[PDB]
Design a protein around this motif. Structure first.
Motif, PDB file in Angstrom:
ATOM      1  N   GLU B 376      18.160  43.221 -46.756  1.00 23.85           N
ATOM      2  CA  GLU B 376      18.671  43.302 -45.392  1.00 23.85           C
ATOM      3  C   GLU B 376      19.375  42.012 -44.994  1.00 23.85           C
ATOM      4  O   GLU B 376      20.425  42.045 -44.345  1.00 23.85           O
ATOM      5  CB  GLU B 376      17.534  43.620 -44.422  1.00 23.85           C
ATOM      6  CG  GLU B 376      17.261  45.107 -44.261  1.00 23.85           C
ATOM      7  CD  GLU B 376      16.359  45.412 -43.081  1.00 23.85           C
ATOM      8  OE1 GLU B 376      15.836  44.458 -42.469  1.00 23.85           O
ATOM      9  OE2 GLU B 376      16.172  46.606 -42.766  1.00 23.85           O
ATOM     10  N   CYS B 377      18.814  40.863 -45.378  1.00 19.90           N
ATOM     11  CA  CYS B 377      19.459  39.589 -45.081  1.00 19.90           C
ATOM     12  C   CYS B 377      20.827  39.497 -45.744  1.00 19.90           C
ATOM     13  O   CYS B 377      21.801  39.065 -45.116  1.00 19.90           O
ATOM     14  CB  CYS B 377      18.567  38.432 -45.528  1.00 19.90           C
ATOM     15  SG  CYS B 377      17.255  38.009 -44.361  1.00 19.90           S
ATOM     16  N   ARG B 378      20.920  39.889 -47.017  1.00 25.09           N
ATOM     17  CA  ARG B 378      22.211  39.849 -47.696  1.00 25.09           C
ATOM     18  C   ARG B 378      23.209  40.805 -47.055  1.00 25.09           C
ATOM     19  O   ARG B 378      24.376  40.450 -46.854  1.00 25.09           O
ATOM     20  CB  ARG B 378      22.042  40.161 -49.181  1.00 25.09           C
ATOM     21  CG  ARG B 378      21.827  38.922 -50.025  1.00 25.09           C
ATOM     22  CD  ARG B 378      22.009  39.208 -51.502  1.00 25.09           C
ATOM     23  NE  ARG B 378      22.173  37.984 -52.278  1.00 25.09           N
ATOM     24  CZ  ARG B 378      21.340  36.952 -52.243  1.00 25.09           C
ATOM     25  NH1 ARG B 378      20.250  36.966 -51.493  1.00 25.09           N
ATOM     26  NH2 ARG B 378      21.604  35.880 -52.984  1.00 25.09           N
ATOM     27  N   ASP B 380      23.256  41.657 -44.073  1.00 29.49           N
ATOM     28  CA  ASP B 380      23.647  40.999 -42.832  1.00 29.49           C
ATOM     29  C   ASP B 380      24.727  39.957 -43.084  1.00 29.49           C
ATOM     30  O   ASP B 380      25.777  39.967 -42.432  1.00 29.49           O
ATOM     31  CB  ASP B 380      22.425  40.352 -42.182  1.00 29.49           C
ATOM     32  CG  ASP B 380      22.376  40.569 -40.688  1.00 29.49           C
ATOM     33  OD1 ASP B 380      23.389  41.026 -40.119  1.00 29.49           O
ATOM     34  OD2 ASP B 380      21.323  40.287 -40.080  1.00 29.49           O
TER      35      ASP B 380
END
Ligand SMILES: Cn1cnc2nc(N)[nH]c(=O)c21
Ligand SMILES: Cn1cnc2nc(N)[nH]c(=O)c21
Ligand SMILES: Cn1cnc2nc(N)[nH]c(=O)c21
Ligand SMILES: [Zn+2]
Ligand SMILES: [Zn+2]
Ligand SMILES: [Zn+2]
Lengths: 429, 429, 429
Positions: B376-378, B380
C-alpha cells in the motif's frame, strides 16, 4: 560542569553538547527515558538564561510551572492564569511540594512561597511577588527580564508589549522551532523530543506519525493548512494555533508602536534538533529601520516534502516536515549527488543509522524527501536558461531541503501597532 | 530495586524494564511460567500507584481481589459485588488466607480484616472499611483515590461519576490496551500476556488464535464487529463488551456534567506490549474546553490487517490486530522499504526471532500485515495527486501499521451527562 | 523437589517440567520404560492435588486403584464398583499388599485398611471410610473434595451431581485430553503415553496406529464417527464411548439444575502432550450466566487432518489427530511459511527429530497434515473477498492445526437438569 538527565549512550547527549558549547554537559539518568530530551533542553536553557541575567533582577515566569521553581534562588514571579484543565493539578502538587519543604530546608525561601500562596488563596487578585492568577497580558507585577517556556498560544507581539509597559526590557522564549509553520507544513515531527503534530484536516491520514485511519473497503476540493493543529508530545495532546505559532517567529528587528513605542530584536541563541531558545530585547523608541526578515540558521538538516496519503479513504497530497540530523545529511551528500531511489535511499539511511540516530518511522519519508530533492536538483542542472533575465510558467516545487549551515529567510511583519473555582480553592487549602 | 516473578532469560523482563523506567526490575521466578507477565505488570503498576499516592489516604479497590491484598499496609477498601460465578471461590480462599494469617503475624491488621468480614457476613449491606458487597456504582464507602484492575465490563464514565460523587478525585485503571477496539478489529491477540480475543461471529474461524473450525467436506450478508467479544487469557474465558471496552479509551480531557459537574483528564502512564495503566483525575467544575481526542502513543508497533478466513466453511474477510515488538519493526524498517512477500517476510521474521521475542503463531499474520502495508505504501508513492486539493473515489485500506513512537488519535465522546446466597454465606463462615 | 520414574535422557521429563512449573522434577527410573510417562503424570497430578487441598478433609477416589494408595496419609475413600473383569485382580493384590504391610509398618493405618476390607467382605453394602462396592452414583460416603482418575465411561454431569448431593464441593479429573473428541476425529494418537485410539469403523484400516488390515488381492455409504471407540494404551485395550468422552469437556461455567441447584466452573490446570488435569468446583445456587463455551489452551501443537486409507479393501477418507510437540511447530514455522511437500516435510521432521522427540510412526501423517495446512493457508492468502460481508458456497476444510499458544473454543452444553461374586468373595479372604 553541567549535569543532564539522559543516559550517556544516547545521541541526544551529543546533540545537547553541540547545542550548548558554553556548558560541559555530562549524563545523569535515573527516572526518565521518554521526556528526558525536552527536560534536559529546558533545564540547559534555564541555566544559560540564569547565568546571563542580573542576579538581583526580578524575572517573570510566564511559562509558569511553579512546582519546578523550588531550587531557583532568583527572584521568580510565576504567572499561573488557570486557563487549562491541568493547571489545578500542578497547583495541587506545588502546594504539596511546599508542604514537603515546609519543614525540611530553610534556604530556598519556603516561608515566603507559602505565605504568598496563602495570600493568593485569600484574594485571587493579589500581586504577590512569587505568584499570581492573571494572564501575562493582565498581570500587574513589575520585573526586569521575563522568561517564557512552552507558550504556543499567546500572540507574541501583544504579550511582549504588555510586558514592556510593565518595564520588561528582556525576554526569553524556549520552545519548538517555528520553521515548520513558516513553511506551512500540514504535518510534521520532532523525532528527538518524541513529538508529532498534524493539521486537524489530516488526523485521519494513514502514514504520518500522528493519525488514525480506518480499515475501509473503499468505494471541499481545497486542502490547505488551517489554524488549528494538534501536538502529540509523547502521549500528551496540545491543541495549538498556526497563527499564534507563526507569531514567535519574530524578525531580527521589529517595532511595537502604540502608546509606548519600542524597537526590539529577536536572536535565536540556542537550537537543538527542533527546540529553540529565542531572545527578544525590548527598548522604547525607534532605533533604525526594520528590514522585516526572520533568519533561521539550520544547524541540522530540515526536510519538508509533499507526500501523498489517503484521508478518509480519499487520495490526497500534503506537505510533511522533519528535522534530519546533521551527520545524516553529511553522509548523504555523495549519494544525493546522484539520482537515488526512495528504496535505495531508505536502505542507505538504515545502514547509516546502524541504537539509532534518527527514529525509523521517519526514515520512510526522509528518504522520499531526499530522492525528490535530488531529482529536482538534477532536473534543474539538466535545463539552463538565459542569465540576467527572468524568462511566468511557474512549475513544480515538491521539496524543501535546508541542509546544515544554510539559512532560511522569511519576510514577516516587523511593525506592530480570576478563574479559580470556589470548590477548587477550598480544596487546595 | 523492584522484584518480578519472571525468569531472567525472558524478553518480557526487558519489556517491563522499558515500560517501568522509574523502577529497577530484577527477575525472581519460582512458581509461574504462563501468567507471569500479567502478574508482573499488575504488581509493578500497583507499586507505582502506591508510591505516587498519599500514604494516609483511603483508596478503593474496585478491581477487588482481596486475597491479593495481604501485604498492602495502605487503607484498602475492596469492593466485591459478587456478580460472577468465581467470586465466591476468591472469597473462600480470602477467608482461609485470613485464617492462615489469623495466628501468624500482627503487622498487616489481620484482626481488622477478620472483624470486617464477620460484620459483612452478619449483614451484607455493611459499609465496613475493608470490604463490601456493593457494585462500584452502589458502593457507599468514601475514599480519596480509587484504583481499578482488569475491569472491562463497567461503563467508565458512570463508575467514575459515582466515585466522584463519593469524593474520588483520582482513579487508576490497569488493563488491556483499548486501541484494538477503537480500530474496530474483529479478532486480535496480546501475544505476550498469553491472551487472544475474538468476536462471537468469528469463533468458528480457522486460523485466528481463538477459534475452533470443523473438518467439513464443503458444499445476512454483513459481517461487522458486534458488542460481545470473548477473551481467552491462557485457558480462562472472559465475555466482554465492545461498547464497555470502548469506554475506558477516555479522551485527554472529558466533562462529566450532571448534578455535580466535573472536568477530568486521562493520561496513559505505563504501556507494555498491550497492557496499559491509565490515570484519570476527577475534579468538580469546568476547567477548559474538551477537544474530544484520545491519543495513544504506540511505544511498540501495532499491526491491524484484514485477513481472509473461512467461517463455517464460507469464505470471508475480517480484521485482526496484534502488537509487534519495537525491535522487530526497527529491524524490518529496511525490508519494508521494499515490496516484501508474506513468505519472505515470514522467513525474515523467523530469522529475527532467533527462545523467541514474538510468538510464532502470530508471525504468519504479522508478515502478511507487513507485506500489505508495504504494498500500500508503494502504491501510494507510485501515484501522486495535486497538492492542496481533495480531488470522492474512496479506495482500499487493508492495513494499519502504527510503528514505534507514532501516535493514534481518535475523536471520542468527551461530554457525559446484595447478591450473596444463603447457603454460600453459611458455608463461608 | 519432586521425583519421577523416567530416565533423565527422556524428553518427557522436560515435558513434565514444562507442564508442572510449581514442582522441581528430577528423574528416578528403575523398573519402567513403557508406561513411565502416564505414571509420572498421574503421580505429579496427585501430588499437586494433595498440596492444594485441606489435609483434614475427606476425599473420594472414584478412580479407585486402592493398591496405589498405600503411602497417602490423607483420608482416602476408594470406590471400587467392581464393574470390569480386572477389578478383582487389583482387589487381590490390594489385599495381598495389605497383608504384606500387615506386619511391617504402623504409620499408614494398615489396621484400619484391613478392618475396613474385612467389614466390606462381611457385608458388601458397608459404607466403611476407605472402601466400598458402589458406583460413584450409588456411593453413600460423604466427603469434601472428590478426585477422579482415568474415568472415561461415566457421564460427567451425573457423577458430579451425585457427588455434590453428597457434599462434594471440589472435584478433579486426571485423564486424556478430550479435544480430539470435540473435533470428532475418527482415529488418533497420544504418541507420548504410548496410546492410540480408533473408531470401531476403522479398526481394519492399513496405516493408522491402531488397526490390522488383510493382505487381500482386491476385487452403507456414510462413514462417520460412532459412539464406540477403542483405546490401545500400550498393549491394553479399553472400549470407551464418544458421548461419555465428550462429557468431561465441560464448559468454563455450567449449571447443574435438579433437586439441588449448583453453578460449577471447570478449569484445566495442567496439560502435557495429551494428558490433562481438569478441576471442577461445585457450588449450590446460580452464580451468573453460563456462556456455554469450553476453552482448550493448546500448549503444544494439535493436528487433525483427513487422511485417505483403505478399510476392508475399499478406499475411504477419515480424520486422524495427533499432538505435535511445541518445538517441532516452532522449528516448522518458517517451512510452513512455504508450500511444503509431505515428502520434504517428512524429511525436515526426521532431521528435527535427530533419541527422538516425536515417534516416527506419526511423522508420515504429521507431515501430510502440515502440508495440507500450508496449502490451505496459501490458497486462503491467494483469494480475498470483500470485508464486512459474508459473501454460501461452503468449501473444503481438510486440516485443523492448533499451533502452540492458541486456543480452541467449542460451544457445549452448560445447563444440565453389589456385584461381587460369592466364589470371588470367598477366595479373596
Ligand atoms: C505547555 N506546553 C509544553 N509543550 C507544549 N507543546 C505545544 N504544542 N503547546 C503547549 O502549550 C506546550
Ligand atoms: C477480571 N479480569 C482479569 N483479566 C480479564 N480480561 C477480560 N477481557 N475481562 C475481565 O473481566 C478480566
Ligand atoms: C481406567 N483407565 C486407565 N487408562 C484408561 N484409558 C481409557 N480410554 N479408558 C479407561 O477406562 C482407562
Ligand atoms: Zn503579577
Ligand atoms: Zn463500600
Ligand atoms: Zn462410599
Amino acid at each position: 560542569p553541567v549535569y543532564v538527565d539522559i543516559d550517556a549512550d544516547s545521541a541526544f547527549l551529543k546533540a545537547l553538547q553541540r547545542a550548548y558549547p558554553m556548558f560541559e554537559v555530562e549524563p545523569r539518568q535515573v527516572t526518565p527515558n521518554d521526556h528526558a530530551n525536552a527536560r534536559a533542553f529546558s533545564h540547559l536553557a534555564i541555566k544559560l538564561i540564569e547565568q546571563e541575567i542580573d542576579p538581583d533582577s526580578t524575572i517573570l515566569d510566564i511559562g509558569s510551572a511553579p512546582a519546578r521553581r523550588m531550587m531557583s534562588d532568583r527572584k521568580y514571579h510565576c504567572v499561573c492564569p488557570m486557563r487549562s484543565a491541568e493547571d489545578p493539578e500542578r497547583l495541587a502538587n506545588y502546594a504539596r511540594k511546599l508542604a514537603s519543604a515546609a519543614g525540611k530546608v530553610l534556604d530556598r525561601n519556603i516561608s515566603g512561597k507559602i505565605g504568598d500562596l496563602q495570600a493568593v488563596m485569600a484574594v485571587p487578585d493579589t500581586e504577590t511577588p512569587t505568584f499570581c492568577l492573571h494572564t501575562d497580558v493582565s498581570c500587574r507585577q513589575r520585573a526586569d527580564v521575563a522568561i517564557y517556556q512552552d507558550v504556543y498560544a499567546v500572540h507574541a507581539p501583544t504579550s511582549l508589549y504588555h510586558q514592556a509597559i510593565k518595564g520588561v526590557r528582556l525576554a526569553y522564549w524556549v520552545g519548538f522551532d517555528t520553521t515548520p509553520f513558516m513553511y506551512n507544513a500540514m504535518a510534521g515531527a520532532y523525532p528527538s523530543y518524541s513529538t508529532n503534530w498534524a493539521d486537524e484536516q489530516v488526523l485521519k491520514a494513514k502514514n504520518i506519525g500522528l493519525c488514525s485511519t480506518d480499515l475501509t473497503e473503499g468505494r471541499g476540493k481545497k486542502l490547505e493548512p488551517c489554524d488549528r493543529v494538534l501536538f502529540s508530545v509523547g502521549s500528551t495532546l496540545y491543541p495549538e494555533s498556526r497563527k499564534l505559532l507563526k507569531s514567535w517567529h519574530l524578525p531580527s528587528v521589529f517595532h511595537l508602536k502604540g502608546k509606548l513605542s519600542f524597537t526590539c530584536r529577536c536572536d535565536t541563541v540556542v537550537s537543538c534538533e527542533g527546540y529553540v531558545v529565542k531572545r527578544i530585547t525590548m527598548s522604547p523608541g525607534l532605533y533604525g529601520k526594520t528590514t522585516g526578515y526572520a533568519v533561521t540558521h539550520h544547524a541540522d538538516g530540515f526536510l519538508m516534502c509533499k507526500t501523498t496519503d489517503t484521508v478518509d479513504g480519499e487520495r490526497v497530497s500534503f506537505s510533511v516536515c522533519t528535522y534530519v540530523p546533521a551527520t545524516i545529511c553529511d553522509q548523504m551528500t555523495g549519494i544525493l549527488a546522484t539520482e537515488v531511489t526512495p528504496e535505495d535511499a531508505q536502505k542507505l539511511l538504515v545502514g547509516l543509522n546502524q541504537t539509532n540516530t534518527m527514529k525509523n518511522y521517519m526514515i520512510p519519508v526522509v528518504a522520499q524527501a531526499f530522492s525528490k530533492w535530488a531529482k529536482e536538483c538534477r532536473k534543474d542542472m539538466e535545463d539552463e536558461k538565459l542569465l540576467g533575465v527572468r524568462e511566468f510558467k511557474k512549475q513544480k516545487t515538491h521539496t524543501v531541503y535546508k541542509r546544515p549551515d544554510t539559512q532560511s529567510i522569511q519576510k514577516v511583519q516587523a511593525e506592530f501597532d480570576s478563574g479559580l473555582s470556589i470548590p477548587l480553592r477550598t480544596r487546595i487549602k
